[PDB]
Amino acid sequence: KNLGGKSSGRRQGIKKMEGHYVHAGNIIATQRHFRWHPGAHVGVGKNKCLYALEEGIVRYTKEVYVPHPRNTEAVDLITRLPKGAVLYKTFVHVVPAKPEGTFKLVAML
Amino acid sequence: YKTKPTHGIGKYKHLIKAEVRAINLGTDYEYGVLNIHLTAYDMTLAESYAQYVHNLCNSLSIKVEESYAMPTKTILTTHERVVQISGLSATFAEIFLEIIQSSLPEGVRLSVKEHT
Amino acid sequence: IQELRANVEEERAARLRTASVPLDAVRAEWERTCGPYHKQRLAEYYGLYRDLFH
Amino acid sequence: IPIEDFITPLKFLDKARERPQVELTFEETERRALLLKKWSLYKQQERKMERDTIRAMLEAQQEALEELQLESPKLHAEAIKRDPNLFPFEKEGPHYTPPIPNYQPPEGRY
Amino acid sequence: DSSRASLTRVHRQAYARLYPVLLVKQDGSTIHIRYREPRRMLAMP
Amino acid sequence: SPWRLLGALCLQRPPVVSKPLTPLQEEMASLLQQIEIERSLYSDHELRALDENQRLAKKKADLAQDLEDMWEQKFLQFKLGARITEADEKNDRTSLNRKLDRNLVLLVREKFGDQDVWILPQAEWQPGETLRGTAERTLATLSENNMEAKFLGNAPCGHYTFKFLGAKVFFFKALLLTGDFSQAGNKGHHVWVTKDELGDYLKPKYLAQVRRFVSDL
RNA sequence: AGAGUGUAGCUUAAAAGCACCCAACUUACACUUAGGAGAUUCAAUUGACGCUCUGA
Ligand SMILES: [Mg+2]
Ligand SMILES: [Mg+2]
Structure with a gap:
């Protein structure tokens, strides 16, 4: 009488751990619900996936969650906490390694 | 992560509560859910004092439930303004019910009616 | 600051959101008080101290 | 029955045409806004007097309940008791006058 | 402080032009109420 | 330690006559009118x-005023009782009708032998008598009137x-919901102090x- | 008599930051917007004006 339920695992989770070198566009962490939020130099997909935006090193921090004011499912939560409470989520950053470019002499005009 | 010292840094639902008999249990004695009726024949003077007692419960930290009205009687309309109140101490049930009494503007009638 | 709130037409413009402040005059007073301490951030932010006085 | 009267009155739709002449003079808006300022200073102290008594009456009541406790420790268990006879409580607001003369006692009531 | 909550105005927008009518209930207890065609002294039997 | 078992009764009277406005309110009571x-x-x-x-x-190109002149003739008809039935008495400290816009506390003078001090009406209570009924035992021990007090x-x-x-x-509390002050010219010295006369008769x-x-x- | 003392209501603030006032939208509250007032108790770390109590 129990049908269905045969779905395979979605293989979501951390692809690049902390300290791992990352190139631009490398998918950091595939997820279904927002478990790790995107930090510095990390973008989001439509399917909530985190991908690096610069070449650098993946770091996981705990940061203060301030949501967007136009997000009412998480602002009406924010206006319900007691007066000292502050939310925290874990964020994924990429501390970019290489600089953006160096000034090189091309000619002696 | 569970093995870590920062485990549960991000738990938040234990700071929200996401869901009456009088509380006189042994010594902690509080009133039940009161009703402060207010009545006059004016749309202003029935709402103006009932705006006051709400802001007085806000300043003096009393859990207000409701501020609704009763449907009028044809007798010229009767206006009723009912403020629900829970939470009174031993000490506070005097200082509330006097300054409430002593600040009624003009012929407006009071109540310490209750639930059901 | 008490005297300016004693002239009645001084707060005439203030409640019509239309009073003004002259920027030439604030400048030659700005460098009297905190114009030095504002230049300390600017010379710290522009990296002068970490390069020119080590 | 969840019936009330916070609806809009249905006869109030059509001929709203009395005073579009809503314009006010420039120095008159000074004193009007000078009064609404000086009333806004008025109610601040009109509140701060009441909030003074809401403490100053109060601290004695705890102090007396402390001065009831030490000398009479059986009996600060009944200063925290509650009265039942407040259930049809009432006080009418104050009036313009002591009520009346004897008589003349009339209205047609329709 | 029974002069506090009496300084007021009909806050509504769908409100008429009402006049400070004086009403006696039963025994000369006269109090102001906003009411039309100002009869300026009232009573009930 | 030996205490002399004596409570008191700070009675309150709710003033039934509303205080007239301040003119500082009345300019705003004139401004809240027109708006x-x-x-x-x-x-x-x-x-x-x-x-x-x-x-x-328009027919004169080819009544509500008799309403308006009649309805002013009922306000001139009904003689308003004053807020001021106080200055015509002006000494009547024995009467509850002494001040009408303010709240009143009873104060009966008595005499002791070793002291002689104006007092708030006292209550020599019994231990097995509760404190709350002692406040009810105070209205009905000396003045013997039928003042309808609630607590x-x-x-x-x-x-x-x-x-x-x-x-x-x-110091207990009571409110005069009504009062039948029989033999208002009693033998005693009950003085209805509004507020400012507490420093006039009660010194220490x-x-x-x-x-x-x-x-x- | 004395002990403690004291920035506007609070400040392990040095003239501030919250509370607080009022008006407009609110059923009211709330939010927000427009506004509103506030203080170093005096005199050279210091001694005499105010409050709180210990006593009479
Ligand atoms: Mg499965
Ligand atoms: Mg499978």
């Missing part, structure tokens, strides 16, 4: 006080202890410190 008048729409009275007389000059609670207000044998005096720190819980307003 109520202008922001409205097409009232039923001026629909029949204006548009009739424009149609009546607040068994909380005290302020404990004052003049010792000689210790003391403790418990044990009776001019009652003031911190009387309704000032």
Whole structure:
């Protein structure tokens, strides 16, 4: 009488751990619900996936969650906490390694 | 992560509560859910004092439930303004019910009616 | 600051959101008080101290 | 029955045409806004007097309940008791006058 | 402080032009109420 | 320690006559008037006080005033009782009708042998008599009138202890919902103090410190 | 008599930051917007004016 339920695992989770070198566009962490939020130099997909935006090193921090004011499912939560409470989520950053470019002499005009 | 010292840094639902008999249990004695009726024949003077007692419960930290009205009687309309109140101490049930009494503007009638 | 709130037409413009402040005059007073301490951030932010006085 | 009267009155739709002449003079808006300022200073102290008594009456009541406790420790268990006879409580607001003369006692009531 | 909550105005927008009518209930207890065609002294039997 | 078992009764009277406005309120009571008048729409009275007389000059191109001159003749008819039935008495401290816009506390003078001090009406209570009924035993021990008082609670207000044998005096509360002051010219000296006469008749720190819980307003 | 003392209501603030006032939208509250007032108790770390109590 129990049908269905045969779905395979979605293989979501951390692809690049902390300290791992990352190139631009490398998918950091595939997820279904927002478990790790995107930090510095990390973008989001439509399917909530985190991908690096610069070449650098993946770091996981705990940061203060301030949501967007136009997000009412998480602002009406924010206006319900007691007066000292502050939310925290874990964020994924990429501390970019290489600089953006160096000034090189091309000619002696 | 569970093995870590920062485990549960991000738990938040234990700071929200996401869901009456009088509380006189042994010594902690509080009133039940009161009703402060207010009545006059004016749309202003029935709402103006009932705006006051709400802001007085806000300043003096009393859990207000409701501020609704009763449907009028044809007798010229009767206006009723009912403020629900829970939470009174031993000490506070005097200082509330006097300054409430002593600040009624003009012929407006009071109540310490209750639930059901 | 008490005297300016004693002239009645001084707060005439203030409640019509239309009073003004002259920027030439604030400048030659700005460098009297905190114009030095504002230049300390600017010379710290522009990296002068970490390069020119080590 | 969840019936009330916070609806809009249905006869109030059509001929709203009395005073579009809503314009006010420039120095008159000074004193009007000078009064609404000086009333806004008025109610601040009109509140701060009441909030003074809401403490100053109060601290004695705890102090007396402390001065009831030490000398009479059986009996600060009944200063925290509650009265039942407040259930049809009432006080009418104050009036313009002591009520009346004897008589003349009339209205047609329709 | 029974002069506090009496300084007021009909806050509504769908409100008429009402006049400070004086009403006696039963025994000369006269109090102001906003009411039309100002009869300026009232009573009930 | 030996205490002389003596409570008291700070009675309150609710003033039934509302205080007249301050003129500082009255400029705003004049300003809250006109803003109520202008922001409205097409009232039923001026629909029949204006548009009739424009149609009546329209037939005159080819009544609500008798209403308006009759309804002023009921306000001039009914003689308003004054807020001021106080200056015609002006000494009548024995009457509950002495001050009408303010709240009143009873004060009966008595005499002791070792002291002689004006007092708030006392209560030599029994231990097995509760404290709350002791407040009810006070209205009905000396003045013997039928003042319809109701109460607040068994909380005290302020404990004052003049010792000689210790003391403790418990200042209670009551409200005059009504009062049948029979034999109003009693043998005693009951003085209805509004507020300012507490320093006129009660001198020390044990009776001019009652003031911190009387309704000032 | 004395002990403690004291920035506007609070400040392990040095003239501030919250509370607080009022008006407009709110059923009211709330939010927000427009506004509103506030203080170093005096005199050279210091001694005499105010409050709180210990006593009479
Ligand atoms: Mg499965
Ligand atoms: Mg499978």
